[PDB]
Amino acid sequence: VETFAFQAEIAQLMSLIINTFYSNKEIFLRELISNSSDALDKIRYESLTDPSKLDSGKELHINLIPNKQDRTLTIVDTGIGMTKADLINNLGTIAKSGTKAFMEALQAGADISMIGQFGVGFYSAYLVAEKVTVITKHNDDEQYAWESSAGGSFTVRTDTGEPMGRGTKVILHLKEDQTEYLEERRIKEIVKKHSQFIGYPITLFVE
């Protein structure tokens, strides 16, 4: 298990997301489903010029899995997935500018629900999760497990769990007072309200 420090700007973004009083927390689901949709769009596009990229799975969809026992809400997709480079250096590099613009916008009248227009909606996961675990698999890399409870650092490890084929699982370890996001009625409401037009099947699991 390797431990890394988030770049200062990202750690700052996460702290703001965690400390700012902001009641409209449900927007986290929209951001994650949107990220899944972009990832699915990408593998689909790429497969048009190279069909073999779908040998790791032809089905393009999204699953929302709540589990009260583990108090987790997992967003699963069979999208493009992320490499080790994405997880450790590239995604953070890109996120640095998005964060800067977002934090300046926030000081102008913008609010946290607009975080997605700055390309860093992933971090809105910390509005409801005390810890986020990301299991991802990209076609020409191995399956990895990224993890962070914020605090300025994250870990990355080669995942020996059950193989996924290709895609990403964002496991949200929910805060004690945010278990409403494990309720079927609540999730259905949010999906219908913010992601009703996603171009991929979204299956909400029942417990």
Residues near ligand H64, by CB under 6 A: 35-36, 39, 77, 79-82, 87, 91, 94-95, 120, 122, 134, 146, 168
Rounded to whole angstroms, how far apart are CA atoms 15 and 99?
Answer: 12
Smallest separation (angstroms) from ligand H64 to the CB of 32: 7
Which tokens belong to 143?
């399956």
Q: Are 167 and 40 in contact (CB under 8 A)?
A: no
Nearer to ligand H64, 66 or 167 (CB): 167
Closest by Cα among 120, 121, 127 to 150: 127
Smallest separation (angstroms) from ligand H64 to the CB of 176: 23
Nearer to ligand H64, 20 or 90 (CB): 90
67 Cβ contact list (under 8 Å, min separation 6): 73, 74, 182, 207
Nearer to ligand H64, 149 or 183 (CB): 149
Residue number of the CB closest to ligand H64 reads: 39
Nearer to ligand H64, 66 or 98 (CB): 98
DSSP 86: I
Smallest separation (angstroms) from ligand H64 to the CB of 98: 8
Nearer to ligand H64, 96 or 183 (CB): 96
Smallest separation (angstroms) from ligand H64 to the CB of 185: 25
Rounded to whole angstroms, how far apart are CA atoms 156 and 55?
Answer: 26
* Residue in the structure block whose two tokens are 């899944």: 36
Smallest separation (angstroms) from ligand H64 to the CB of 23: 24
Pseudo-torsion of CA 112, 129, 131, 142, nearest 10°? -80
Neighbouring-strand partners of residue 75: 64, 170
